[PDB]
Amino acid sequence: GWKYFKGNFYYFSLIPKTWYSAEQFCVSRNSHLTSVTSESEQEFLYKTAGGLIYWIGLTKAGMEGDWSWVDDTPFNKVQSARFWIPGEPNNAGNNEHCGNIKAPSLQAWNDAPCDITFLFICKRPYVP
Ligand SMILES: CO[C@H]1O[C@H](CO)[C@@H](O)[C@H](O)[C@H]1NC(C)=O
Ligand SMILES: [Ca+2]
């Protein structure tokens, strides 16, 4: 069921999980919750999501609570500004330390509590 896009395969899950149980599932399939590093990747992802919410690899790191990618892609604060839903990350209830694709727009991301269950997206490199 993996979908191919620009050097990577993507798994859009059929069952919802917490952010971490999702990441564990991805790792068991030799992947990670997806990073997003271009406008074209964001578009591929939200279009494929078809209006449903999917955990991606966004999660907090460091004392300052900076956002990061679980697959260790450096997080670019400047280049990613255009990818959040206006008002996000708003850190609701001071307990939203993971990120998902929520809105069907380039401005797609929301921070939500890591312990809520959602469908999720894994990303796995193709290595020729
Ligand atoms: C009302 O709460 C929801 O909407 C806000 C944005 O208005 C979001 O910022 C907030 O994360 C989201 N909560 C959950 C649990 O998904
Ligand atoms: Ca939020």
The burial class, CB within 10 Å (0-12 / 13-18 / 19+), for 9 is middle
Residue type (1 letter), 128: P
- Residue 49 CB-half CA count within 13 A: 27
At residue 30, φ and ψ (nearest 5 deg) are 60, 40
CA terminus-to-terminus distance, the chain: 19
In whole angstroms, what is the distance from residue 32 CA to residue 70 CA? 7
Can you tell me which atom of ligand 1 is nearest the CA of 89? 9
Displacement of CA 85 from its chain's centroid (Å): 13
Q: Tell me how far the alpha carbon of residue 47 lies from the centroid of ligand 2, in angstroms.
A: 21
In whole angstroms, what is the distance from residue 77 CA to residue 83 CA? 10
Can you tell me which atom of ligand 1 is nearest the CA of 90? 9
**Domain span including residue 20:** 1-128
Please tell me the total count of domains within the chain: 1
Ligand with the closest atom to the CA of 55: 1
Indicate which CATH number applies to the domain containing 17.
3.10.100.10
Who contacts 24 (Cβ-Cβ below 8 Å, separation ≥6)?
none
User: What DSSP line would sit under the chain, residue for residue?
Assistant: -PEEETTEEEEE-SS-B-HHHHHHHHHHTT-EEPP--SHHHHHHHHHHHTT--EEEEEEEETTTTEEEETT-PPP-TTTTGGGB-TT-S--GGG---EEEE-SSSSS-EEEE-TTS-BEEEEEEE---
Question: Buried b / exposed e across 62-100, counting CB within 10 Å, b at 16+?
Answer: eeeeebbbbbeeebeeeebeebbbeebbeeeeeebbbbb
Task: Assign residue 30 a region (left: φ > 0; alpha: ψ between -120 and 50; beta: otherwise).
Answer: left
Task: Indicate the resolution in Å.
Answer: 1.8
- The pair of structure tokens assigned to 14 is 């059929």
**Experimental method reported for this structure:** X-ray
Q: How far is CA 44 from CA 34, 105, 125, 128, in A?
A: 12, 11, 16, 22
The burial class, CB within 10 Å (0-12 / 13-18 / 19+), for 21 is middle
- The pair of structure tokens assigned to 113 is 């509590």
Q: How far is CA 23 from CA 56, 70, 71, 85, in A?
A: 9, 8, 10, 23
Ligand 1 and 41: CB distance under 6 A: no
